[PDB]
Amino acid sequence: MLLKNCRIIKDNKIIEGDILIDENGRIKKIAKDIKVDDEIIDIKNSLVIPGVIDAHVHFRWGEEKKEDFLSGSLAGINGGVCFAIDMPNNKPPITTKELFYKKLEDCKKDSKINVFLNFGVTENNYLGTVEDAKAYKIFMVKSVGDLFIEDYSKLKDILNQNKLFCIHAEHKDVINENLKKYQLNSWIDHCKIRDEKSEVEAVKEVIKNLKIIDRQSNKKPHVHFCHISTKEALYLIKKVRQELKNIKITVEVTPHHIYLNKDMAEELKGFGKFNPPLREKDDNIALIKGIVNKDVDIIASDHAPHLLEDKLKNVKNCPSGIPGIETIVPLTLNLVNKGLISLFDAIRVLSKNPAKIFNINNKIEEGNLANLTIIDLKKEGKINAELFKSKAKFSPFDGWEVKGFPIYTVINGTLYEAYGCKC
Numbered sequence: 001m002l003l004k005n006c007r008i009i010k011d012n013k014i015i016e017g018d019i020l021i022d023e024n025g026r027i028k029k030i031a032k033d034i035k036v037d038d039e040i041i042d043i044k045n046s047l048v049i050p051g052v053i054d055a056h057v058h059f060r061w062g063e064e065k066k067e068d069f070l071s072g073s074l075a076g077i078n079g080g081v082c083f084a085i086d087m088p089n090n091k092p093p094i095t096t097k098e099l100f101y102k103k104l105e106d107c108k109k110d111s112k113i114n115v116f117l118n119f120g121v122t123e124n125n126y127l128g129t130v131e132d133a134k135a136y137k138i139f140m141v142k143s144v145g146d147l148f149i150e151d152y153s154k155l156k157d158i159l160n161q162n163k164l165f166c167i168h169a170e171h172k173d174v175i176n177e178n179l180k181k182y183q184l185n186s187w188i189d190h191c192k193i194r195d196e197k198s199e200v201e202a203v204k205e206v207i208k209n210l211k212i213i214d215r216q217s218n219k220k221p222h223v224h225f226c227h228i229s230t231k232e233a234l235y236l237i238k239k240v241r242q243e244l245k246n247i248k249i250t251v252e253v254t255p256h257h258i259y260l261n262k263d264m265a266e267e268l269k270g271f272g273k274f275n276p277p278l279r280e281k282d283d284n285i286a287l288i289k290g291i292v293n294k295d296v297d298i299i300a301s302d303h304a305p306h307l308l309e310d311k312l313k314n315v316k317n318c319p320s321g322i323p324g325i326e327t328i329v330p331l332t333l334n335l336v337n338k339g340l341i342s343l344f345d346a347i348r349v350l351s352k353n354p355a356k357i358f359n360i361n362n363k364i365e366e367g368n369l370a371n372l373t374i375i376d377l378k379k380e381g382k383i384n385a386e387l388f389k390s391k392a393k394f395s396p397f398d399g400w401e402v403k404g405f406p407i408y409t410v411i412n413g414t415l416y417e418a419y420g421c422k423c
């Protein structure tokens with residue numbers, strides 16, 4: 001297949017050229033006006049970027065009414081996402097080697113995109129190694145089963161390893177104290193119970209232990225904070241990065257924590273209920289500036305589908321989480337078009353940094369498998385949840401008009417239409 005008339009992100013510039021993909025799905029040649037007898041697709045000077053990586057999704061193994069590997073990977077294709085990293089809070093949670101490989105088998109059967117699996121860390125399994133896991137997920141609050149570190153005194157021992165850890169950082173003791181002071185009556189109460197302090201104190205708890213490891217140990221963990229949502233946690237991470245010599249810290253934010261804030265909580269109802277919850281407008285601003293200042297490393301969706309039936313319940317019965325894999329790319333490109341981040345900022349947080357952090361080769365280079373996201377940067381259009389391929393066909397962004405859509409997704413050389421080729 002020949003992709004004709006591409007504007008390509010290669011190295012760190014925009015070059016015009018054609019991309020020739022051989023029948024093994026590998027990039028065979030990148031050059032201007034390639035003239036070959038082949039199937040030809042005219043890209044019409046759309047932008048071709050190294051395939052987007054969504055480092056934080058929940059495809060709901062064991063709970064397939066909510067999402068499965070097929071519907072989740074069709075949603076990724078629709079969203080322009082070539083790689084996804086799936087979290088281990090399943091039913092049952094992925095806390096043993098045997099469960100990992102049983103899930104991996106199901107993943108292989110039906111995923112249409114490149115999916116990687118994280119392993120779930122417990123107080124009992126944390127020294128174990130799973131060769132094919134991308135990262136080890138630590139929940140500092142209850143999730144499912146024993147996938148929840150209840151004893152924070154063990155964090156130093158858990159983190160003192162040459163491993164890539166992803167951390168859901170909310171502080172169990174702050175939340176328990178708040179549950180004694182507030183009733184869960186309306187949507188804003190979720191934001192007060194899991195308040196900004198509960199995130200900040202969890203981040204502080206991790207950082208205190210990393211300083212010890214950095215000084216007293218020869219292990220060099222990499223710690224990736226999932227969905228950071230507060231200005232104060234970002235500031236603390238920025239500070240401690242100047243103090244640590246051996247340990248690398250990376251930071252992920254979500255589209256909903258950039259765009260949405262707790263003044264919207266009562267209007268969003270269940271579609272605004274997620275963990276960590278809605279924050280202040282000042283936090284939205286801090287996260288955007290953190291992208292521009294390169295304090296924020298990646299954007300990931302925390303794609304967390306639930307049944308619509310349950311998301312329409314009252315705050316006490318409504319599960320936390322929203323789908324997002326089909327909106328992460330348009331919402332990020334929309335920031336470029338509103339002048340809040342640069343085009344290269346968007347490429348960095350969606351494609352280049354996740355590839356560096358998680359060791360994924362999405363590069364547009366001759367010889368590499370072709371995993372490409374093709375975007376129409378200027379296309380204006382409405383997000384319409386009825387056009388989602390996820391089983392979760394709803395979103396707080398439903399009906400929003402944004403600018404910038406993926407139009408094609410190329411998975412290991414196979415061309416698919418994406419959301420914007422129906423807009």
Ligand SMILES: NC(=O)N[C@@H](CC(=O)O)C(=O)O
Pocket residue numbers: 058089168273274275276302304305320321322
């Ligand atoms: N974030 C959420 O609100 N929900 C996620 C879990 C998580 O990322 O904590 C889910 O799995 O539903």
Ligand SMILES: [Zn+2]
Pocket residue numbers: 001002021022023038039
């Ligand atoms: Zn071909």
Ligand SMILES: [Zn+2]
Pocket residue numbers: 037038
């Ligand atoms: Zn021929």
Ligand SMILES: [Zn+2]
Pocket residue numbers: 068069070071
């Ligand atoms: Zn299915």
Ligand SMILES: [Zn+2]
Pocket residue numbers: 168226227275276
């Ligand atoms: Zn989380």
Ligand SMILES: [Zn+2]
Pocket residue numbers: 164222248357
């Ligand atoms: Zn690393």
Ligand SMILES: [Zn+2]
Pocket residue numbers: 239240243
């Ligand atoms: Zn310090």
Ligand SMILES: [Zn+2]
Pocket residue numbers: 196230231279280282283
């Ligand atoms: Zn705040």
Ligand SMILES: [Zn+2]
Pocket residue numbers: 056057058087302304
């Ligand atoms: Zn998550």
Ligand SMILES: [Zn+2]
Pocket residue numbers: 307309310
């Ligand atoms: Zn239900």
Ligand SMILES: [Zn+2]
Pocket residue numbers: 309310
């Ligand atoms: Zn019900």
Ligand SMILES: [Zn+2]
Pocket residue numbers: 380
């Ligand atoms: Zn307009």
